[PDB]
Amino acid sequence: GGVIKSIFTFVLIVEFIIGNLGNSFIALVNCIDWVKGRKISSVDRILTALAISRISLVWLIFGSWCVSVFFPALFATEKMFRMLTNIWTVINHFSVWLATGLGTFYFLKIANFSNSIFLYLKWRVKKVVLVLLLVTSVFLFLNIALINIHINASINGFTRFSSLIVLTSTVFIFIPFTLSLAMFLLLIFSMWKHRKKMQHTVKSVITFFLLYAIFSLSFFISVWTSERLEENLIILSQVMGMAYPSCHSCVLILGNKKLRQASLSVLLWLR
Amino acid sequence: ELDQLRQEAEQLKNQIRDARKACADATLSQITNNIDPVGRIQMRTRRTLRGHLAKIYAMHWGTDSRLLVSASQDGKLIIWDSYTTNKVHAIPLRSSWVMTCAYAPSGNYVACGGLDNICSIYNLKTREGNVRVSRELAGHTGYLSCCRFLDDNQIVTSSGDTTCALWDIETGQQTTTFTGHTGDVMSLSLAPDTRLFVSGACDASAKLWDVREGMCRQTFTGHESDINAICFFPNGNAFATGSDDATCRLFDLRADQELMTYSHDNIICGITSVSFSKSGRLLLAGYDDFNCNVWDALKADRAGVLAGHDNRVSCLGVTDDGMAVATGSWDSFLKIWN
Amino acid sequence: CTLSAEDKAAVERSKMIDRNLREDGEKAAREVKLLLLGAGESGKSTIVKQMKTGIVETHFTFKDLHFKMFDVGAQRSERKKWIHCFEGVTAIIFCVALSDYDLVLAEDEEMNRMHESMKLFDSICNNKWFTDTSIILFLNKKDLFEEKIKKSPLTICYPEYAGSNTYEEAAAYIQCQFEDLNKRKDTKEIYTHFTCSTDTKNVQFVFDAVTDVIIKNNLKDCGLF
Amino acid sequence: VQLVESGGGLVQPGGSRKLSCSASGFAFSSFGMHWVRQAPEKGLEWVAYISSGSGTIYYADTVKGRFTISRDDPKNTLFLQMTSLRSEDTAMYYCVRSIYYYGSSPFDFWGQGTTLTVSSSDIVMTQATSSVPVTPGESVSISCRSSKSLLHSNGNTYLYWFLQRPGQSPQLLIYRMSNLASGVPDRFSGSGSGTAFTLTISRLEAEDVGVYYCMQHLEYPLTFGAGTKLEL
Amino acid sequence: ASIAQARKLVEQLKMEANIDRIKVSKAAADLMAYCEAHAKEDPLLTPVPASENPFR
Ligand SMILES: CC(C)CCC[C@@H](C)[C@H]1CC[C@H]2[C@@H]3CC=C4C[C@@H](O)CC[C@]4(C)[C@H]3CC[C@]12C
Ligand SMILES: O=C(O)c1ccccc1Nc1cccc(C(F)(F)F)c1
C-alpha cells in the first residue's frame, strides 16, 4: 500500500535525477560547442532538440507528481487535468517521434542494404526526417482528438478514465517505439552482415530495446489486469512512461562520441 | 670553367647585396613613425555566397565590382552577383581539379585551370546562351597555379613546371615563355599598367618579369619557405608576397629589397591569399588558420581580424573601387566583408 | 517585394542553378573518388587494366557504385602543395611491386626501389592532410615475386629478416613491414591484399574496402566513433 | 539561332488552336519565352510568358483563362494553346527568347512569327509623334514617355527599344535605356531621366528604317508603345 | 651542358645588377605619399555611410 507507493515515488525521484542530469548534460555541452564555435553536426542538432524536449517532458511529469503530492484538490480540479494532459501529449509525442526520427537518421545514414526502396530512401535523410515529423503530426492530431473524446465520455458520466488515457497513450507511444526497434534491429543486422563479409575478405542499446520493451508490455498487461491501488496507478504510469525520456537519453550519451568525451572531461573535473 | 662561372655568379650576388645595403638608410618602419595609425577596423560579413559543395580554391572579382567568379573542387565555376546573392551562371568544368580562376577586365571571358595542366577559357557573352569553352590552352607540364587576363586576347598563366607563359587566345600558343624560377611558380600578379607582372614561387623568390621583353628584370628573395600568394601595390612600384613563413613582405620595385615584413608571434601558420586595399594602406592576407588578417602597410601592425571562416581561406580579393573584400575559404562559403 | 520583374526572374534563374547544383552534388555524394599512387617500378598501370598531361581520371561502375580513380604519377612537381587538393578522397590505393625488393633505382643505384616505395608510403599515409583517409595496399606482381624469391632472401631489401624464403612467409613479412609505417594506427586502416597481373577479382577487394570506408565515415559523421 | 513558329491561319471563331514555335540553335531550356502579338495594322502587345523550368507563367489581362503557354524543353518547342477566340486576336504572334541575369539581354531574339485570323493599372507609354520623316545621315531623337518612373530602386532603368523593319521580325536595339544589344551599330544611343526617355541616332541609313517600339519592364503586364515609324 | 646554364645564370645576374636603384627613403616617401593621397578614397579603410554602401 503506502510502502510500494513511497518506493515508486523514490524511483521517480531518482529517475528525475538521472534524466535531468543526462538532458542538461547534452544541452549544455552542445550549447558550449555552439557559443565557442566548435563542431556542430546534424546529429548533435537533433540531440539538442531531443534533449530539450525530454527536459520539458520530465519537468512536466514531475510537476504532475508534485501537484499530486503538494495539494490534492489541485490534482483533481479537472480542467487543470485537461490542460496538463494536452500539454503532456504534445510534448511526449514530439519527444518520441524525434527519437524515432533520430533512429531513422542513423539507419538511413549507416545501413548498407541492397533493397531498391532502401537505396531510394537512403540519400534523403533530412527530407525523410522532416517528412516523418510532418506526417506524424497527423497521428498527433488524431491522438489529441481521441484523448478529448475519452475525456468528454468519462466526464459526461476519473481514475478509471486515468487507466483508459494511459491505455490509449500507451498504444500511441508503442507505435513509434516499434518503428524504432525495427530500424535498430535492421541496422545491427546490416552492420553484422558487413562485418562478416569483410572478415571473410552497441550492446547496451540492444539491452535497452529488450528490457524497456518488456517493461512497457508488462505495464500494458497490468493496465489490462488488476488495478489495485488505483490512486497509485497514476504515479506508476508516470514513472513507467517517463522512464524512456531518461534512460534513452543516457543511452544516447553512451553512444555519441562527443558526449562520451564531455563525460570524460566532467570526470577529469571531478578529480 | 664551371668553377669560374660559379665564382662570377657569387661575385655578382655579393655586388647586388652590397648595392642593396648601400641603397638602404632607414627602414620603412622608421620613416613611418609619425604617421597616424589606421586604427582597428570593424568589418562584418555583408553577404555570404553559399552554393558550392566543395573546397573553394580561387575567386576573382570583375571590373564592375559586382560580379564574382569562384572555382571549387566540385568541378563547377560559379558566377555570383555580389550585391544580391544570385548565381549568374554555373560552368561545369571538365576537370574537377581547379586551383585558379580569372575574370577578364572586359568581363566577357572567364579563365580557369588546375591539375589538368590546361588553361580553360570560357566565353560568357554567347549567342547560344550557354557558356562554352572558347579555348583550352595546353603546353604547361605542371599544375596551373594562377592565371590573369592582360586583355581579351592575352592571358598570363604560371605553372608548376617553374615557368610562366603569355598565351594568345586566338592562336592558342605561348607568345612568350618566362623561365628562370628554380622552384614551381605558384602565384602571379599583374601591375596596373599591364606591362610588368611579378611571379612568386617555390624557391622563396618573386621575379618581376616584363611582358613585352620576356626576361626577369629583378628577383627578390627574402623569404624562407614557399610563396603562395602575391599582389601588386596599387601604385605598381611595389608588391606583397605571402609565404609559408607566416610573414608577408612588402617588396619595392625601385628599391629592390624588402621594405617591411608582417610577422606576429601568435600566428605560425602559412599565408594562402594576399590582397591590397584600393588606397594601399591596408594589406588583407588570408592566413592558414581559418582567418584573414588586415595589416597596416606603412606599419607592421594588426589593423583588424576578419574572423568568421570555418576552414582554410584560399582565395582573397578586393574590388576595384575597394567597397568589399571576398575571402572565400575551404568550407565552401564565399564571404563578402565590409 | 521591392524587386523588379527582371530581378525576380534573375532570382528564379539562381534558384534553378541551385537546384542543378544540388542534384549534381547529390549524384557526386553517392559517388566515390579514389587516389591511385605508385613508386619506383609503378606497376599500378598494369592493375589499372584489372579494374578497367596531368591528372588521369578513370570512371567505372561496380555493383551500382560509381568509382572515380585518379592517377597522378605524371604530375612530376612539388607534391606537398597539390596533395591537399585530394583531401576527402574516400581511399588511397598504393600499388607497390614486390619485384622491387631487389631492383634498384635508375639513379643512385645505392638506394633500393622497395625502400623508396616505403618512404613514399610513409610520406602519404602519415601526411597531415590524409589523417582520416584510408589506404588500400595492393602488393602486386606476386607472380614475378614467386618466380624470383627462391634466388635471394629478403635480406637484400630488409636485412632484419628471420623467416624462410617461401612466397607466403615473405608476403606476410612485406605486408607487415609496409603496415608498420602507419603511425596513426587508430585513425586509418590499411586494407592489404596481394594481386598479380592476371586477376579479375581485385575490383571486389576495392569494392569491399570502399564500402567499409564509407560505413566508417557514416559512423563518424553520425558521431558513433 | 532560329525560333520558327508553326500553326495558325484562318480559324472559325470561338474555337481552339495551337501555335508551336520550334527552338533550334540555342539552349532553349535556360531561356524564358514570351508570346507577343501584332495586330494586322496596329502595334505590339504582350500576351504570355513562361520562365525557365516553367515555374513562372504570366498572362496578359486580355488572354487570361482562355490562353495557355507551355514548353517542351526536351523537345525544344514552345506551345501556345488558344481557346475561345474572339475578333480581337486576329494578329501576328511572335515567340521571343529572354534570358534573365545581371547584365543579360532580355528579348534578345525574336522569331519570325505565325499569322492568325478569325472570322467575324498598367503603364501606358506613349510615343506622341508616331511618325517622323527622316533623311539619311541625320541625327534624330525618338521619345517615349512613361506613366510611372521606370527607374527602379535597384538603380536600373527598365526601358527597352526594339526595331521592326518592314515585313520582318522585331530586333532588339537598346535594353535598360543605356545598354546596347549585341549586333547593333554604335550610332544608336539612348537617354532618359526615369520618366521621359529618347533614342538618338547619329546617322540614318536604309537599315534604320522601320518602326521603333518602347517597352516597360517593371510590372509584368509589360505594355509596349504605339511606336514611331521612319519614312525616307 | 650545365656550363650553359651557369653562363645563363651569370648573364641574368649581370643584367639584374645594372639597374637604377633609388634611396630606400625616397621609395618609402613615394609609397606613403600615394597611400595618403588616395587614403580618403578608400571605402575599406574609412567605411562610407551605410546609405552610400552598395552592400547594405
Ligand atoms: C507507454 C508509456 C511510455 C506511456 C505511459 C505514460 C502516460 C500514459 C502517462 C504519463 C503522464 C500521465 C498523466 C500525468 C498526470 C495526470 C493528472 C491526473 O489528474 C490524471 C492522470 C494524468 C493525466 C496522467 C495520465 C497518464 C499519463 C499521461
Ligand atoms: O537509439 C536509438 O533509438 C536508435 C534507433 C535506431 C538506430 C540507432 C539507434 N541508436 C544508436 C546509437 C548509437 C549506436 C548505435 C549502433 F551501434 F547500433 F549503431 C545505435
Overview of the molecule:
Chain E: Keywords: Acetylation, Cell membrane, Host-virus interaction, Lipoprotein, Membrane, Methylation, Prenylation, Transducer. Chain E: It is found in: Cell membrane. Chain E: One of its GO terms (molecular function) is G-protein beta-subunit binding. Chain E: One of its GO terms (biological process) is fibroblast proliferation. Chain E: It is a lipid-anchor. Chain A: It is a multi-pass membrane protein. The complex is a heteropentamer of chains A (271), B (338), C (225), D (232) and E (56). With 271 residues, chain A is an all-alpha fold. Chain A contains nine helices and no strands. The relative contact order of chain A is 0.14. By secondary structure, chain C is an alpha/beta fold. Chain C is built from six helices and six strands, in the order αβαβββαβααβα. Chain C has helices at 5-30, 44-51, 113-125, 142-149, 167-179, 202-222; strands at 32-38, 56-62, 65-71, 91-97, 134-140, 190-194. Chain C has a six-stranded mixed sheet, with helices on both faces. In chain C, strand 2 and strand 3 form a beta hairpin. Chain D is mostly beta strands and 232 residues long. Helix content of chain D is 0%, strand content 44%. In chain D, the strands form four sheets. In chain D, strands 2, 4, 5, 6, 9, 10 and 11 form a seven-stranded mixed sheet that branches. Chain D has a six-stranded mixed sheet with strand order 12-20-19-14-15-16, with no helix packed on it. Chain D has a four-stranded antiparallel sheet with strand order 1-3-8-7, with no helix packed on it. In chain D, a hairpin with a 3-residue loop joins strand 15 and strand 16 (179-180). The radius of gyration of chain D is 17 Å and the shape is globular. Chain E has 56 residues and is mainly alpha-helical. Chain E has one domain: G Protein Gi Gamma 2 (Irregular). In chain E, 54% of the residues lie in helices and 0% in strands. Chain E is elongated and about 65 Å long. Chains B and E meet through helix 1 and strand 17 of B and helix 1 and helix 2 of E. The structure holds cholesterol and 2-[[3-(trifluoromethyl)phenyl]amino] benzoic acid (FLF). Residues 99, 103, 106-107, 110, 180, 183-184, 187-188, 202, 205, 251, 255 of chain A line the site of 2-[[3-(trifluoromethyl)phenyl]amino] benzoic acid. The site of 2-[[3-(trifluoromethyl)phenyl]amino] benzoic acid (FLF) has 14 residues of chain A, from helix 3, helix 6 and helix 8.
Quick structural gist:
Helices cover 8% and strands 45% of the residues of chain B. Chain B contains two helices and 28 strands. Chain C has six helices and six strands.
Brief descriptors of the model:
heteropentamer, D: 232 residues, 7-stranded mixed beta sheet, 6-stranded mixed beta sheet, E: 56 residues, mainly alpha, G Protein Gi Gamma 2, 54% helix, binds cholesterol, binds 2-[[3-(trifluoromethyl)phenyl]amino] benzoic acid, intellectual disability (chain B), signaling receptor complex adaptor activity (chain B)
CATH topology of chain E: G Protein Gi Gamma 2
Query: Helical amount among residues of chain B, as a percent range?
Result: under 10%
What is the CATH H-level superfamily of chain B?
YVTN repeat-like/Quinoprotein amine dehydrogenase
Give the percentage of residues in beta strands of chain B.
35-45%
Number of strands of chain E: 0
